[PDB]
Curated annotation (Swiss-Prot):
Cellular localisation: Cell membrane; Secreted
Reported modifications of this chain: Glycosylated. Glycosylation plays an inhibitory role in the interaction with IgG3.
GO terms under biological process: antibody-dependent cellular cytotoxicity; cell surface receptor signaling pathway; immune response
Every Ig-like C2-type domain range: 18-74, 99-157
Its job: Receptor for the Fc region of immunoglobulins gamma. Low affinity receptor. Binds complexed or aggregated IgG and also monomeric IgG. Contrary to III-A, is not capable to mediate antibody-dependent cytotoxicity and phagocytosis. May serve as a trap for immune complexes in the peripheral circulation which does not activate neutrophils.
Entire-sequence positions represented here: 23 to 193 of 233
GO cellular-component term (any): extracellular exosome
Protein name: Low affinity immunoglobulin gamma Fc region receptor III-B
Summary of the tissues where the protein is detected: Expressed specifically by polymorphonuclear leukocytes (neutrophils). Also expressed by stimulated eosinophils.
Miscellaneous comment in the UniProt entry for this protein: Encoded by one of two nearly identical genes: FCGR3A and FCGR3B (Shown here) which are expressed in a tissue-specific manner.
Record's bilayer topology term: Lipid-anchor; GPI-anchor
Molecular-function GO terms, alphabetical: GPI anchor binding; IgG binding; IgG receptor activity
Length: 171
């Protein structure tokens, strides 16, 4: 009767190439069959462990991920997106409820450092940071809906991220 769940570790749905992602399956097992079945898009993959680890993500790792065990039925789809760029604005989801926490992160490419970071909403500055820190909105309002992106300096390069559209619902 219980359904399995796929968790992303770290919580970000959108990753950049070369990033590490661990997809966890939460299900029930019986001593006879200890394996886990993983599904990429609609196709069965080779991983039989509790957690599927992607050491260095490629564009081919994008898509829907599902999992099931012998005692847990097929899980709901979990989407993973892989981008190529100097910067990326990450969030746990793109749809939030009102009074819900929003954790945004301005993530730069592997082995690169970022400074003079600016988080923007609808073309306007929300928060500036001299050094790379995350952007936290503990309680989301209806004023928090819109187009977000982050801009910063990777050494000398003035680079901006692609747009993420955040939707805020009431119920």
């Amino acid at each position: 009767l219980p359904k399995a769940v796929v968790f992303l570790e770290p919580q970000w749905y959108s990753v950049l190439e070369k990033d590490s992602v661990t997809l966890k399956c939460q299900g029930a097992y019986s001593p006879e069959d200890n394996s886990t079945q993983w599904f990429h898009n609609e196709s069965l993959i080779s991983s039989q462990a509790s957690s599927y680890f992607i050491d260095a993500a490629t564009v081919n790792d994008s898509g829907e991920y599902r999992c099931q065990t012998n005692l847990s039925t097929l899980s709901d789809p979990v989407q993973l997106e892989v981008h190529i760029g100097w910067l990326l604005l990450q969030a746990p989801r793109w749809v939030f409820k009102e009074e819900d926490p929003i954790h945004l992160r301005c993530h730069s490419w592997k082995n690169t450092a970022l400074h003079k970071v600016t988080y923007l909403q609808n073309g306007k500055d929300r928060k500036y940071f001299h050094h790379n820190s995350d952007f936290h909105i503990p309680k989301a309002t209806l004023k928090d809906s819109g187009s977000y992106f982050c801009r910063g300096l990777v050494g000398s390069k003035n680079v901006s991220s692609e747009t993420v559209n955040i939707t805020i619902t009431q119920g």
